[PDB]
Ligand binder design. Sequence first.
Ligand SMILES: [Zn+2]
Ligand SMILES: [Zn+2]
Ligand SMILES: [Zn+2]
Lengths: 196, 124, 46, 115, 57, 787, 105, 147, 69, 131
Amino acid sequence: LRLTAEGNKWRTDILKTSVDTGREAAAEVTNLDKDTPADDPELLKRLQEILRDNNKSGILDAVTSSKVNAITSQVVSKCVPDGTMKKFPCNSMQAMALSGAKGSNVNVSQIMCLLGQQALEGRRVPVMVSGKTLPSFKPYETDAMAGGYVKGRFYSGIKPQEYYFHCMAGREGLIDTAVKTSRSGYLQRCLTKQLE
Amino acid sequence: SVVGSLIFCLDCGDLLENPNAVLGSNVECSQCKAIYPKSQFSNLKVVTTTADDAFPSSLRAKKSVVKTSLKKNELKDGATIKEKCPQCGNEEMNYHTLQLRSADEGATVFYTCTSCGYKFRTNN
Amino acid sequence: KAQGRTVPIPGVKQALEKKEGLFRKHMMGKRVNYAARSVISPDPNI
Amino acid sequence: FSIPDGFKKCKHLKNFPLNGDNKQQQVWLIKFPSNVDISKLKSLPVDFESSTTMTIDKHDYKIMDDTDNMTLLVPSESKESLKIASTAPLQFDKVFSVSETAKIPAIDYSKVRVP
Amino acid sequence: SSRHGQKGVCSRKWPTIDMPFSETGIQPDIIINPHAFPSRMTIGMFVESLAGKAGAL
Amino acid sequence: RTADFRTLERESRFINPPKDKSAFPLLQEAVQPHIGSFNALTEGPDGGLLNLGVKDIGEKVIFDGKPLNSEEISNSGYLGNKLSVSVEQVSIAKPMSNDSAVERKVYPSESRQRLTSYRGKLLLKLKWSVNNGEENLFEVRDCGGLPVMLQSNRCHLNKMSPYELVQHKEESDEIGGYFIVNGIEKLIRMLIVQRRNHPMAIIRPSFANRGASYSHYGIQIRSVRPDQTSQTNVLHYLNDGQVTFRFSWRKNEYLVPVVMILKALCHTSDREIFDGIIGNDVKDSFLTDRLELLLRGFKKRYPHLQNRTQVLQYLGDKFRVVFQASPDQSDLEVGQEVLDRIVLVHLGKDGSQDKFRMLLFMIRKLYSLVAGECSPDNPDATQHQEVLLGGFLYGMILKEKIDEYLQNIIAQVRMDINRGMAINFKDKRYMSRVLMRVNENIGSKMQYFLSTGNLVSQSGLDLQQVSGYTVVAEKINFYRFISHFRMVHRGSFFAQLKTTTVRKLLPESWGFLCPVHTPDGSPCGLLNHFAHKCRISTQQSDVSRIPSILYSLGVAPASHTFAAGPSLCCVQIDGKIIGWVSHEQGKIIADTLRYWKVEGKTPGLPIDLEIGYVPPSTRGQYPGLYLFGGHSRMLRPVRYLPLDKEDIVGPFEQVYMNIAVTPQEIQNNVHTHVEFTPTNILSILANLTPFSDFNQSPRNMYQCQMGKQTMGTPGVALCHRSDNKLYRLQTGQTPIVKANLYDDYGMDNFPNGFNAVVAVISYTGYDMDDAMIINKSADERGFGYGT
Amino acid sequence: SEIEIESVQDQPSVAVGSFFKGFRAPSDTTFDLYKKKEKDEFVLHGENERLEYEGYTDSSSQASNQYVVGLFNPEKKSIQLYKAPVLVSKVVSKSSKNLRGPKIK
Amino acid sequence: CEFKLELAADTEKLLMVNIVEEICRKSIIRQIPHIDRCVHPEPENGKRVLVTEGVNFQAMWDQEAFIDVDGITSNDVAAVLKTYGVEAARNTIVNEINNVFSRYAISVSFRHLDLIADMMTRQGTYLAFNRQGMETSTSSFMKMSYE
Amino acid sequence: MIVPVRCFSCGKVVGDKWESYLNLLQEDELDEGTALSRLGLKRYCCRRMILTHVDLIEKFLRYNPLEKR
Amino acid sequence: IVMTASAAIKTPQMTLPIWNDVSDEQADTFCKSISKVLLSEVIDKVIVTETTGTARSYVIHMRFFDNNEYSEEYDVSKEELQNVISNQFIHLLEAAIVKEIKKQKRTTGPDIGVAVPRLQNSKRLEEDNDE
Ligand SMILES: [Zn+2]
Ligand SMILES: [Zn+2]
Ligand SMILES: [Zn+2]
């Protein structure tokens, strides 16, 4: 599960560019030249317009997600496998994913690199009427972490804000398994009785 | 006092009736039989502009400061992984993880080939 | 097809259509002799 | 009417200087809390707009000023009780409101944010 | 099950002679298959393993 | 140097159960919303909820079929002799056993072994008033065995120290909160209900499909009486421009024009209604037309109703049958009786002026929602809800049963006067004869609710569901048992919906509802569990001293100001609109209040008070300074940055609050609070999970369900129990790897597992994905043995 | 800018009574003031040929707030202060004191 | 566009803006029957196509200068059957069922789909696997054991 | 309940070392680790056996239906 | 398909194969030519000046988007807009006002005292997945 000192250095350096990404995407959807500051009064008014509309928030979420996911893909492509301390065939975690015995390179990357952007029903993390994604974050915060982008991995651990956001996305799937009325029972029963 | 299309009594404050519904030359309040009108009240007008959100159109969306529509070509899914595509063989593939069936069951990975666009659902 | 008495006793039509029906529950499908049921356990030596 | 019980009619009412000439006359309305003593203060510091500062025995106050219904009743005579003020209904020239303001302490970040 | 949501049915009660024996001379009480962890991603159990050993010693 | 386990301390406490204050106060703090709720039923100010409830149900009138015989037109109008029956006081006794003469104390252990109920004698002072108190007859009537809650106000264990509990065959640190009914421990499940005394702007497609030209827009306020009984009032915006008042009496819905219910409360002009809703925003054409539709519509429909008395009489005449208030009660009395019992009951009687001001605010909020000025309030969100505690629910149904009890007395008298006529009401003999022909066993009726969970009521309370209010306090292991008293359900009605928004984990739940502890499958996101440091309000205090503090801080009185809208800040204390201020000053008051709140120098401002400030926004939530102090509120402790002291926060006020997680993450000029520990956001079972910040989200969730299904320790006082079935691990062991909160809840009293040598190995070939191997020689030595 | 005060009157003299937006009245009628004896509550009452005026002080506002009215000079820069109670006044008409049977059918 | 409306003295107050608003979103400038919107997606496997949110073949038949009338596909089986015949509807059934499976990356042999389609089109119509389609079956015992 | 006879993993008798362990923690005032070493428990399997023992029997015994009070 | 053989499909569609001689711009113009256009889609603002004199006078001003804007976004001309307002919209507006006058005079208000309609296995639904 460990990365080498060289491989872990790459991880911290690529994830260091992710801090700018949050505001960069927020400035792109809002349409503002020279990349305005994160605390800009016109930008904060512009982000509010986005908050009140389901479509406008969707454009903001899809742009920020694609940009942070590009940072994720970079971390994974660099660190795995050329940055892992123990390497295949000896790295059993890596071996099981490559052999097709159990698991995939996606699970391996969440363990050794980062969880990534926590996607909820196609979009990012839900946001309150106050413009806050959590009571810890600033209203209309232009940061990747605030949107649900988890820089942390399961090996090193995940921060409480990231933990709560992971809890959201984790449960989201189980909720869909509870609300799914569609069954193949009657569909097959109708065909078999007429085709027997 | 007179406000908009409404006309209120100066003594009690009860809303006075429309001068067209009752008899001509004189009008009176329902609470107290007060002496009205003065004829200086004039034919009132009320300007009512549209909810501006009342007409949602593709052009109205093109008018509203913030990006309301994404580009056809500029369409990106999730993060990319080094998993080979089973349709063509593209090393790059977009991924998305979810938890289906049970909390006992393993994590489900949803793949999307960046080359063709083949959707691939696999648990392990 | 009978008047309400102050759940009534089932008729012969009701007997043939109790739930899934006599045809589905006792003709198309049946409980069988010389059969057993148990929890399955893995084994690579068989 | 006569009701309610324990209420006595006001026979004696002090004189009010009302003229409204023209170098003109101004009528002011002020809101004050029950904690402060009006008879103690013989001078009130007030300036235009919302900006105001006042300190009466350790307690700090602020005099809110607003441009803009209430009806003023001035006594014409002690026997005539109270009547509605008029010149040509009457409105106040300037309206003020005293609000008790407390100084919230600045967060000692060097003491609270610890690595 | 461990305190990390890794439940499994008892497949067999393996004899100690047939059980793998450690350098110390200890044979495990419970055997968990390594193919359980890549899908579940229960790393809390992995750190619990080296913490529990350190605390026992 | 370490975060060690108490071994010497543990074993000493096992032998010596403390004779002083019990260890692990957090364990008693877990059952605090249960015991506290039942405690407030008799103890506390105003004589408890039960004495307040009988004070609210009032009298029940019946007239004798006897003439006046006076030497007249009075004879024909004479209804006969009046009989007004009510209940002054309500008494509850601790469980006792009489054998006819001298009474003996009966403890819970006895009730369990006997397979009977842990009941307390319910007494209630009946008032038999004749011809409006010309002769009054009082009788303290025994109304059966009311099941009493364990470790509560009326339980024999509440005073008992760990030593005394063991000597009385109970657990050393017995929690309580449950009821022993026919040998089965049953608890009243906590419910998520709309936050009390707050107007909620809601968009619902349900409102449209009910009537003709009905829109999605509407306002909903859940007004609660001091006896904890609720009465919801709904406002509807019709496409015609008409506003209607919706309410419920018995189990039927009723609609009345809002301009009618306004004019019934207090004498006002049409312009007083205009100034009350439309403030200085007189030029708003949208509002100018809608208000004209209301006022002209009322004048067209009801031209005869020209004064407050006529309106009350018209209201009394149409509701005289449903409200059953008859046959001597005037339409003015019945009219006022409708108002006092239905319209904004949270402000109560002798507060019609307060009810009028709050109603105008609801109309303005309704018009702000239609226009778009205000975003709709989310009912499914934690900010717009409170928690109906078991003890309060128990008190509500009790109030219902005593109302039924009085109705039955009248029913027996009505039977008597409609046949043999019998005798007069002044005779004690007749009263005693009626009373023993009436079913007075309220204890059995309350025992039924605790034995079935089925809600049998004439009003149906302000709840949607009718079943599953009670659940068996399953003691298969302590982890499952303690989680029962920290578990909260949205409602049985919500479980049968295609909507997923209800099940969705929201940021509003931070520190109140646990993000991990929720079941898998069907109860996912519905059957939640509270955070370990979360608390629920049992009552309110110093609430009457706060308006004096607000008025001094610059709040202009609502009775003199006459200006309303989202353009100005509205100050409210428990739904009581007290004044008006600017939005700039609105925050200044809200920040200065919190400062004097945490400071122990202010006597009139309590630390548990909720200061819900809502700043003005572009198409956001309706702004205002909505303060709260009342019961059922969700509360949690946080560290207030200035002064460095504890502050109590609610889910409503938190939405706009900036609370840092760790002190190192505090940002300047954008943070006012910090968390004590991030562990405060998780449940007891969620905190107990080792290195949960290293596990994948659904695995932490599955562990809560696992620890609940484990064969651990269900108790140590088993030799004095007689439960259906119990699972007991013989060789319990203390975890080497553990969260320190394991000791704080004294989980060592009930071990749930064992420390095993586990090797992550694929060797045997019989272990693969869902199958694991156990050592034979370990099993032979008693490893994991259970009974 | 410190403004000086000439005189303060703690005795009843001048009072203020809020009605509604657009109140005129005949401007020849009188208003009888009443007082009750910590904090004194005031009651206002007037009479007219077709109308009647009734006013009272808010119990929650009187004990917490103290209202004062003053006259300002443009040259002397001195204010003469006089305590004035705020009375929530309502106007009743000739149409009032109208009602039907206490019990109808 | 400005226009004045004159109403009677008895008509009194009315919310005209809300009345106008509702009629504007109800008023159609131009609409081709049964079709709501015509979009231009990315060329499917190299084929230049336009996806319509409605079905009317006879209207598209007039657009011969833009559309190849011999390749106009439609998901609606009944609509295809009504205009192009039973064999065309049969081909729509095998293609549409395949689209359902291909989206979820599930491969089902066309031999199965062809058999299912042929069974649905056995009567020259479009029969479904239910009580209605079954009515035309010889075995009363098979029918009795269905419902 | 009571101290188990023999270590679940190897089988080294542990039942005679429970009361002796508490005496090394109380009277001798030693740390958990050194106390287990003096008892002759070097394998971590034998180490956890006594170290991790709860001894709920002392809690269980306080309920005696054969003696008054 | 299989179970109901519906003639009324939820999402009925048509795939139109475009020629090679028809360009990407021409095809997008063609898409606009067939797509349903509503009056709402071309209107920017509506100003109603309700004035009561002599007769309720309603001055309805239709402020549309610029002529070149909607002609390039919906393929709709000013002539096309004239025909719809002068033939459809006014006839539809007149019918809506007449209906609103009748609805006002029909029911004067809701009935007071008369009850109106209400607004809105248990253990099986309370069972988790393992249960
Ligand atoms: Zn009048
Ligand atoms: Zn591919
Ligand atoms: Zn050992």
